[PDB]
Amino acid sequence: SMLERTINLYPLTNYTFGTKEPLYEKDSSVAARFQRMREEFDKIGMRRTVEGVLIVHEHRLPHVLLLQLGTTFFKLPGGELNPGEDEVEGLKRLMTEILGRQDGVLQDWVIDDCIGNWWRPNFEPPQYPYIPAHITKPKEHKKLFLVQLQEKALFAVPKNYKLVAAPLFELYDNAPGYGPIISSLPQLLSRFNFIYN
Numbered sequence: 001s002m003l004e005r006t007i008n009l010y011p012l013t014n015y016t017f018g019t020k021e022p023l024y025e026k027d028s029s030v031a032a033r034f035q036r037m038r039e040e041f042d043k044i045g046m047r048r049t050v051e052g053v054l055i056v057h058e059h060r061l062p063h064v065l066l067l068q069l070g071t072t073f074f075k076l077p078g079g080e081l082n083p084g085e086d087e088v089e090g091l092k093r094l095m096t097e098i099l100g101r102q103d104g105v106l107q108d109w110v111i112d113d114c115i116g117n118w119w120r121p122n123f124e125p126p127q128y129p130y131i132p133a134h135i136t137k138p139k140e141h142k143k144l145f146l147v148q149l150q151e152k153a154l155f156a157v158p159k160n161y162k163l164v165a166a167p168l169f170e171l172y173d174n175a176p177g178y179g180p181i182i183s184s185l186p187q188l189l190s191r192f193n194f195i196y197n
């Protein structure tokens with residue numbers, strides 16, 4: 001009757017947030033983003049993205065780590081898989097590219113839980129937690145995973161990003177602020193048995 005996954009959380013003060021060089025988006029605009037998605041869909045088919053949910057606490061209040069591009073949009077650490085690339089190896093690679101240390105010490109990502117799937121039916125912003133009716137060729141499949149952090153770690157945050165710890169209450173029913181994936185993380189995380197270390 002204990003059917004919940006147990007996840008260790010550590011205080012945000014256990015983590016060091018260093019800095020490194022800016023990491024630029026492949027796309028300079030929404031228009032270029034959907035143009036490249038169109039181009040790549042014709043060459044290699046559906047885009048496969050992976051995103052990591054990294055959780056900490058302060059004073060037993062869980063917080064999700066988000067990347068803020070300057071003071072603009074909020075994203076999860078993650079990105080695009082290469083064709084034939086394993087989802088979990090790919091998320092580990094992407095989280096190393098974004099948050100990995102300037103001193104090149106190997107970081108230990110633990111990924112054991114899928115927490116959701118989102119599908120983009122068109123070359124347009126809307127994403128859904130299912131393949132919508134009549135859609136046979138979704139343009140993007142996004143996979144979210146829970147990343148179990150170590151007790152302590154040093155992260156290097158690209159100088160053009162801020163790493164922000166968002167409490168769940170701030171995400172909850174805040175799609176305008178965070179969009180439909182990040183704003184549904186409180187619901188998606190509720191099944192876990194968090195231990196506040």
Ligand SMILES: C[C@]1(Cc2cn(-c3ccccc3)nn2)NC(=O)C[C@@H]1O
Nearest residue numbers: 073124125126127128178179180181
């Ligand atoms: C994740 C977002 C925002 C967003 C809005 N919608 C949505 C869903 C249903 C109906 C109308 C809008 N889905 N995702 N999509 C992007 O392309 C980047 C941005 O972060």
Ligand SMILES: [Zn+2]
Nearest residue numbers: 058059060061
């Ligand atoms: Zn406390």
Ligand SMILES: [Zn+2]
Nearest residue numbers: 119138140141
């Ligand atoms: Zn799919």
